[model samples]
Target chain A: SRVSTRSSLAEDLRAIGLADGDAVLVHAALRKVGKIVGGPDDILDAMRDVIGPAGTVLGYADWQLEDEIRDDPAMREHIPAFDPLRSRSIRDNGFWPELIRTTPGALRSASPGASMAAIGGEAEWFTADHALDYGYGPRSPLGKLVEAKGKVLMLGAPLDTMTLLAHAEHLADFPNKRILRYEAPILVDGEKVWRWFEEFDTSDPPDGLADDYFAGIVEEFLATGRGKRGKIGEASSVLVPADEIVAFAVDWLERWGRTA
Target chain B: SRVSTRSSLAEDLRAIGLADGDAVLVHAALRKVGKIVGGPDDILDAMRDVIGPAGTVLGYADWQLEDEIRDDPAMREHIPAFDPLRSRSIRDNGFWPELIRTTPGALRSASPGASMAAIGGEAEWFTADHALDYGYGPRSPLGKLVEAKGKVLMLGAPLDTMTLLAHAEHLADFPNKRILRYEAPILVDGEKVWRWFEEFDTSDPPDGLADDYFAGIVEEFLATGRGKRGKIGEASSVLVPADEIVAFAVDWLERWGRT
Candidate 1:
């Protein structure tokens, strides 16, 4: 009776209006979607079917966890702590294999975009080398999407909740480099390990995470960047370029290796 | 040569599609109208001709002086001190006479309504009795005009500068009976004299005088009365009633001797 699995999700997409090559971004409460009787694997399967080979479906896996990590001190400490029972590595469990690799035709832009998906959680899957250099900064994803010139699909979410503008913050600084550093935890066979990574210097991250703070960050970035930039803060479909994605990856790698 | 009085203004109004009996609220900077080669009297004459016998013209006289009195300590001290040069009096030279009687065929609404006239400079006028009270506050004229369910002609000013909402503050407290006391200077035989007067409290007067202070006063009045009563900010013009004006005068006389 309860719906679950990627295949079921694909059926639901057909019930709605999804077509091949459609780009969709989703913000969801999994439990709200009802019991996934088919499990995560099935859900991924459904999603892949609905998306087909041409369609791309992406969802925010970091926002809920990142928000939890930031607001709850206990959760924040437990994230990095070597706990056998509770320590959750977003990379291994949430994003990398489950959403990125398992889902058929599901693709995340290798470059970050305005969505919070680019910051914490499984960011390394999209931005491996530069992951350690930046905090889950604001607007870090806009550059990635812009570089890719890709289309974005927002499913059941409003634009105000976007984190892409943070990426614009990154582009303003360094111009051709990145500006953050951090250490990531990797899970191997249920064992967790930590590693340090530096972000591209050209990609400047926003200074804060709050909305008004982001607005100020945008203002500052725009003031320094010498042009007006459009902000994508709504649920819609967008088209991005593949070249931009490749360029973003190169920049990410260059900055990840740079020291100081 | 300067423009002709009545016809020139009438032409200007005609060009703007404003006709007689149309209610108007005005926010103006007298200087911005350019050098008044004809002076206040000529300007007044021109306005009268254009508005005709039935049309109403209202202006804000209180905000200018209120701002000056609040900011300039010397002006404030001179008010009750009977100082000749600095004190403001509501009796003879204030905005009331120029508005109620002198403006030629212009009928001052016993109730609140939109005002149509120039703003800015020494030409601006407001009285304590009428300055801050709602329904007949600084924007009373505009409020009345709106209540009359009439059209408001905005002449030579921006919408943000409109004061019509201020008058709506009084519709509740002084709705039918309220009076306020104000101290003003009266000129007798070229001699300046200080005296206190009570007038119908149709307008809500501020507790204190200051540019910084008035905004809070406006907010507080609206919050407690008009706004609380569920009237939109712009709709303050529609809330005033005529009987309330008489009741205010009666209560005013009860508190202070009639002049």
Candidate 2:
């Protein structure tokens, strides 16, 4: 049982090829990081230390724990509408996302179920103008991360948790690609208004791939001997270029595309 | 099992003597309110409905669950400084307080151990200038609540959970009153700085009073038939005048003082 202090975590981040002034999307499991001294806040502090003041840390902060509430008329009538500022991030993605969303000076995208949060330099740029439709497409935060040549940091999180693959799914061409449509309440001029949104179906793995397609794609990408691997405390971690992984995933999806 | 909806809960509030334009400090146990629809947020909505737009609803929101972190020097060094907007409300006070604190229009006091949160018209008045010293005393939200002629709403919350009684503790003329002092990190000019604060010992009952002094005072006040009692869903509820209760508590403390 190791105790992870701020200094120790910074050392681990530097060892994993996380350089100063880099924009990194981080996924982590706190318990896997050992008995951390200052709880979850220390990890963000450690990232700040390694990346310096110029670097940015990003998190996926979707907030649809009880998605059914939107569909049920009676429940929807009285429920609090989603305010990007106030809504709790989905707990299923783990606690770090919500902490990032709540941290002062952290900016979050307005996309409800596909919202992203970031802290430090370029946070605003990554989160701004998050497209309501096709939230994972080119106009979204994942697209900006790809354009910036950002890095994806995995600290004890599962390979399937790489959300950047969703962006790749939006890009990959396949016959009869699945699409989903629903209406959600969003804030406009500080008023609650229902808006219909359309996007490629993201509820399951892309067409012609295994159920755990993100994991399959990541495993295949790792098989190519790309990405830096190390340990942050007891957690096995990885740091890989977001553009490279998304490119690999798109190619994989295209190669496995269902044909006539 | 009964289910409490926003509409039904608002009706219960009106029946319990809460009305338009009343400022109320609410303490509640959501579990005791039965299977409430829309969760804790419904209770806040119901309060808003009954009290109307001119009213204010408040909750005690202390965030010192890990108070020991401040005393341990090494742990304190790198810990996130307490921000009124971001620090979590003490879960021991129940879940409703945190919800109120995070509500978009809600305002919260800067008092760390004795912080209070409010939503509505008088919210700014209640939370502004919350004195770091004597956190539950004259300049605190509890003091302003007393001054504003507010009402205390107890929905299935225990009699001892009445925090306004602490304001009475400050005013009570009792000899050899206990005092406590501690240093905590607070945001001054957006920077973390340690500041020492002093106040009457709130950890335990005031000297010469019973161990459950707040409950004793509240029960004694109710004995005189001062408050309106009813049920909000399945939970037994009470609505009492804040100034009256504080006055009763002060008198009780004075008469029961050590000889």
Candidate 3:
């Protein structure tokens, strides 16, 4: 495995087409990558370098875990309340999101599901609304990212494991998707209170076919030559426009969710 | 008296360059206008006609109000709990907004200070997020409208009374404008709870030169030949692109707020 530095990662980011004024949604698995000088911080610096001061870097942090809250109604009150500015996510979200969110100017959208954080240009625009139904659909952070003509970067993480953008399509899949209403505690005027959420059930296929049913759609998407694959360290990565992946997934799920 | 029918008002809406696929922010004074065949519903229908299903009509619904929420912290608590889906606006926001928000398929932002309601295309896009520091800045519904090439329609409402578009400029008047935090009650888990909001102080100037600071800016704007003037019934109105008015106000406020 080749060791990498911030400048080298910056080159990789440029080769991956992350540039000035671009809004980026990045996913990474640092464990899969080679040695870095400053770890996640260097990777973040490189991203900022490629995109410049005019660009933005976004990361997802769905504060609640599957086992923590799933099928456990009472557990909802136990998980720490969702904070708009300060909250930690699991390492699976990548060390970078947790690290980047801690940066001085970082902004995070408050939510119990599909939450995202951003730093730099248009961070607020992308991180402003996350606590809504269809957390990834048009109106959520992903929606704004698409509307802003952003790009998606999956570095060292497999497309199936890292493609959160696909959920935007899931929200619109089958002309109708499962709608579930639950309550989660969030900060409201300095007090902890339960907030009701009525969102399209984005977890798995309603027919109980499989959880990765939508992942299969993304696997077929790379075949269309829409994303460019490259190397950042010892890890393979791909960068594609946000709208392309969303529209592509929407087209696929439109047919597949119904047929399946 | 123009005795306008829905079709006639629809034609008037078209005269203001509102067409299909357009997003309009309307500030109306329904009482100023002649009797409508269906009242506010007719004016709303005429607006819906020209814009089509592809277009959207947005109305501001700040749950707080003048003479009511003014300087009285207690009144803030007494006002109806702000609802993202079911709160009412004062008649000052005009009768049309209250009606449009309750329409079969209208959406409202959750902000208590400068909440807005919308119907038709791109309505969700604008009404999605209104709970922010500067409810009219680049991240709010007003911001999305500007980003989406929307427009502002002051239908029968006085420019002095309905130029909330200028407040977006006030938010950015200086590199850093005034910001304040206040608490308003909203629904959470079917329980009314206080919700804290921190937004740019889009109110009186620090100098207090004018109670209608935003209105003065609009007066300067109309003088610049930017907005188009038209009539629906018995009242005059101005229609202009969202970004144009906002950017113009930005320019004006940058100068006015500074010196």
TM-score of 3: 0.48
Root-mean-square deviation per candidate:
28.3, 3.3, 21.6
- Candidate 1 vs candidate 2: which has greater DockQ? 2
Candidate 1 docking: what grade?
incorrect
Model 1: per-residue lDDT, tens digit, A1-260?
A: 43243444555655545555444343332333554432333444454466564544444433113433334443333333222122212332233222332222222322221122222223333333323244234223334334434333323223233344434334433334434454444344565465554554323332222344433432343354422222111112222232332344335434544534
For residues B1-259, could you state the per-residue lDDT of candidate 1 as single tens digits? Answer: 2323333444554544445554444433333343222233334445445556455445543311242343454454333232212221232123322332333223322221222333211113221122222335434444445454433333333333334433333333433344656654444545645555554443444333233432343344334343222111111221122233223333443333222
lDDT of 2 at A115: 93
Model 3 lDDT tens row, B1-259: 4556677777887887788888888888887778554345667778887888888988887764343343356444433355566445655676677667756578888666778889997788888766555676666777777888888888878676554554555455465555677765667756777667776665655454466666676777778887788887766888888787777767766776576
Cα misplacement distance, residue B218 of candidate 1 (Å): 77
Q: Model 3: what is its DockQ? A: 0.01
Question: What TM value does the first chain of each candidate achieve?
Answer: 0.40, 0.96, 0.89
10 residues in a row with least lDDT, candidate 1 chain A = A230-239
Off by over 4 Å in 1: A1-18, A22-25, A34-43, A54-56, A59-131, A134-161, A172-260, B1-259
Residue-level lDDT of model 2, residues B26-138, one tens digit each, is: 99887888866556677888999888988999999988537676788877666666678877788788877877886778888998899998999989999999999989898
